[PDB]
From a paper:
The [name]-[name] binary complex was formed by incubating the catalytically inactive [name] (D513A) mutant with a 139-nucleotide (nt) [name], which was determined by cryo-EM at a resolution of 3.1 Å and showed a clear density map. The [name] used in the complex was generated by fusing a 45-nt crRNA with a 94-nt tracrRNA. Compared to apo-[name], the REC and NUC lobes in the [name]-[name] binary complex undergo significant rearrangements, creating a central channel accommodating the [name] guide region. In the [name]-[name] complex, the [name] is bound to the outer concave surface formed by the Helical 1, Helical 2 and WED domains, which establishes extensive charged interactions. The 3’-end nucleotides A (-3)-A (+1) of crRNA are guided from this outer concave surface into the positively charged central channel through an opening between the WED and Helical 2 domains. The short R:AR duplex 2 is located at the entrance of the central channel and forms extensive hydrogen bonds with residues from the Helical 2 and RuvC domains. Additionally, the short Nuc domain, consisting of 36 aa and containing a CCCC-type zinc finger, is visible in the binary complex and was found to be inserted between the RuvC-II and RuvC-III subdomains. Additionally, a third zinc finger motif, the CCCC-type zinc finger (Cys711-Cys714-Cys735-Cys738), is clearly observed in the Nuc domain of the [name] binary complex and coordinates the Zn2+C ion. Although the remaining electron density of the Helical 1 subdomain II region (aa 232–355) that contains these two zinc finger motifs cannot be traced in the binary complex, the orientation can be unambiguously discerned using unsharpened density maps. Specifically, the region spanning aa 232–355 region of the Helical 1 subdomain II, which is positioned away from the core of apo-[name], swings toward the central channel of the binary complex.
[name] is an endonuclease belonging to the type V RNA-guided CRISPR–Cas family. However, while most known type V effectors use this domain to cleave DNA substrates, [name], the Cas effector of the newly identified type V-G systems, stands out by exhibiting RNA-guided ribonuclease (RNase) activity instead of cleaving DNA substrates. [name], which is a thermostable protein identified from a hot spring metagenome locus, functions as an RNA-guided ribonuclease (RNase). [name] adopts a bilobed architecture encompassing recognition (REC) and nuclease (NUC) lobes.
Author numbering: 14 to 114, 120 to 231, 356 to 549, 563 to 595, 613 to 767
RNA sequence: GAUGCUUACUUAGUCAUCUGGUUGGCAAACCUCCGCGGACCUUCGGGACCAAUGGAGAGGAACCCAGCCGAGAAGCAUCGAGCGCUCUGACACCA
């Protein structure tokens, strides 16, 4: 499908006043830039507003404007595989004709007809004013703006909507099968119990009301009463991260021997730049400016301080596999997106991987099943379905890196550290509330403490990802096995509930998964995420699937355990790694304990 | 490795008992009401978002800005250790 994983890997450095430049002069310059960023965001938001109305609706006959929409979103498929001009240049030509700001054979007759249909539509007041302003812009700015709007609308609407469609079809089939297999006794009787809840304010799927004793209707409601929710569209809000202004070619002048960057604004003419100092390129960082030239510069604001991003090209490594990672993600996202659809997804993924292998996959498939625990973590290694050895990973960060916590708040990147900042926040927002009441949360209230906590969490995730990548590179792996854990929470997470602010301190296992997947696809590897199956409470040697629930947690609290059935003595992490490595193969099944 | 001076510098990459502490606020910044106009979802109750070459008030608790103290980056200057040279913790960066 779409090439989700590109080869860009952009790097962000903070901007600093140049030593020659005066501090007041630097404040005046960051003011000129803040204005340009605001204008760019406004223009992109307006163009997205104009273009969102041409989408083809689900369950309706196709309108004549659809093929222009698909050309605008994905010119690569629309254009022939070979053409001199880049696809984005063709996108700009189509957009100008559509908005009223094409005979080239690169464009098809259907595309021209659809754009003719599109242009013959009424323009709102916002659209007319936006196009009047956009007329004056340079073709480079117009093209960059159109590309950014297209990528934004694609990523933020179309992916989620297509996933929602595929989810909805399976929801139809599953509800039909459910209604036609066990409960044949509810053709209409559901209405009698539904009406009483309808007349009241019960606008929620999971009925947060305790059982009355229809309870079969209750299980039916929490499952198949309402359709899967449709994704809610938004625009590039300047309050959140939103998008980043792009200074393409001939607009930036970055120097590296000494770190100064020549940014150029839209109004500024040729040969004039705004020089700023920035954090110098790391020496140990593997790529260097000499290796690959910088394609463009991406600017965005955190808090009020500007940051810049350098975009360069880094080639990918060809994987021994004859398939892509996007297909493996596609299976789970679209083909099997449900809870019964997990066993089928895993079987299909295993088949697809095995058939794509050049030689004998069973004899030689270098596999590394990594589990992610709290204090510690270990990864198993498989070559041919035969366990070789388990490796420890150093993931506790203190004055030095260790593999385990040495023997009240633990110094270093720990739950205690994060939770102490969460408590500070819980004790500091109160007085803000009272003072605001006296005068008479927001995403600017504790704007330094939260950004610090976010940087801490992402640093922890980066540590985990790089450690895993290094372990995989040590012994030439081709496949990394990961679970679907949500994440861990710090001690102060629960006492700061009801606020999205507390989400800054969630440990984000998914962030680790994304980083690992990106870095693995970087090096010619594949990542498959099995569905959560609680590997910790499953013995690798014999699949006992322990359920004591009282003694197991105590054993995990000291890092050792003992299987109830036979008596294996391995540490919890090694057991879980072996369990995942087996589960990828056919030797262990998913619980599937829904009924 | 130690020591001293200077800097329109940093204290908003993380950790090492650590967004360092403190004093205040004209401009400015930040903050609160609208709201021309656009728009996504919706159980129609409402939720969420952008926005005028757009207009009105207000806090220095929070946001922002400035001063002071503590500290660290370097350019130079002294001595030293090891072997003139090498000489300042660990990690980590696809935002
Ligand atoms: Zn056992």
């Amino acid at each position: 499908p779409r090439p989700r994983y590109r080869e860009e890997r952009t790097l962000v450095r903070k901007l600093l006043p140049r030593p020659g430049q005066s501090k007041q002069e630097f404040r005046e310059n960051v003011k000129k830039l803040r204005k340009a960023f605001l204008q760019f965001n406004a223009d992109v938001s307006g163009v997205c507003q104009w273009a969102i109305q041409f989408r083809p609706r689900y369950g309706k006959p196709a309108e004549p404007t659809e093929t222009f929409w698909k050309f605008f979103l994905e010119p690569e498929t629309s254009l022939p595989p070979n053409d001199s001009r880049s696809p984005e240049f063709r996108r700009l030509q189509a957009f100008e004709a559509a908005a009223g700001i094409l005979d080239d054979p690169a464009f098809t007759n259907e595309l021209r007809d659809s754009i003719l249909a599109v242009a013959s539509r009424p323009k709102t007041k916002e659209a007319q004013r936006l196009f009047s302003r956009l007329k004056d812009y340079q073709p480079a700015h117009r093209m960059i703006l159109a590309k950014v709007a297209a990528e934004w609308i694609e990523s933020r609407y179309r992916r989620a909507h297509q996933n929602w469609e595929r989810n909805y079809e399976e929801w139809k089939k599953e509800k039909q099968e459910w209604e036609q297999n066990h409960p044949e006794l509810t053709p209409e009787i559901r209405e009698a119990f539904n009406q009483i809840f309808q007349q009241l304010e019960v606008k929620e799927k999971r009925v947060r009301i305790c059982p009355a004793a229809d309870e079969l209707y209750r299980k039916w409601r929490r499952e198949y009463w309402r359709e899967p929710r449709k994704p809610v569209f938004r625009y590039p809000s300047v309050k959140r991260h939103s998008i980043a202004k792009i200074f393409g070619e001939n607009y930036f002048q970055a120097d590296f021997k000494n770190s100064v960057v020549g940014l150029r604004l839209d109004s500024m003419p040729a040969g004039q730049y705004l020089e700023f100092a920035f954090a110098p390129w790391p020496r140990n960082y593997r790529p260097q400016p000499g290796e690959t030239e910088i394609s463009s510069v991406h600017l965005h604001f955190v808090g009020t301080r500007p940051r810049i991003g350098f975009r360069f090209r880094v080639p990918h490594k060809r994987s021994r596999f004859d398939c892509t990672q996007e297909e493996l993600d596609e299976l789970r996202s679209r083909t099997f997106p449900r809870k019964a659809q997990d066993q089928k997804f895993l079987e299909a993924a295993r088949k697809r991987l095995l058939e794509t292998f050049p030689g004998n996959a069973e004899q030689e498939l270098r596999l590394l099943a990594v589990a992610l625990g709290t204090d510690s973590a270990r990864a198993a290694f498989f070559i041919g379905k035969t366990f070789q050895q388990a490796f420890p990973l150093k993931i506790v960060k203190i004055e030095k890196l260790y593999e385990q916590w040495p023997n009240q708040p633990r110094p270093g990147l720990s739950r205690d550290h994060v939770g102490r900042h969460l408590q500070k926040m819980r004790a500091q927002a109160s007085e803000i509330a009272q003072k605001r009441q006296e005068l008479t949360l927001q995403p600017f209230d504790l704007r330094g403490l939260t950004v610090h906590t976010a940087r801490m969490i992402r640093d922890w995730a980066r540590l985990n990802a790089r450690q895993i990548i290094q372990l995989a590179e040590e012994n030439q792996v081709d496949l990394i096995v990961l679970e679907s854990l949500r994440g861990f929470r710090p001690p102060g997470y629960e006492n700061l509930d009801q606020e999205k602010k507390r989400r800054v301190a969630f440990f984000a296992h998914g962030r680790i998964r994304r980083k690992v997947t990106e870095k693995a696809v970087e090096r010619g590897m594949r990542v498959v995420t099995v569905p959560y199956l609680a590997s910790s409470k499953v013995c690798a040697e014999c699949r006992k699937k322990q359920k004591d629930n009282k003694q197991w947690e105590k054993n995990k609290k000291r890092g050792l355990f003992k299987c109830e059935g036979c008596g294996s003595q391995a540490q919890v992490d090694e057991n879980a790694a072996r369990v995942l490595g087996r589960v990828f193969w056919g030797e262990i099944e998913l619980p599937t304990a829904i009924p």
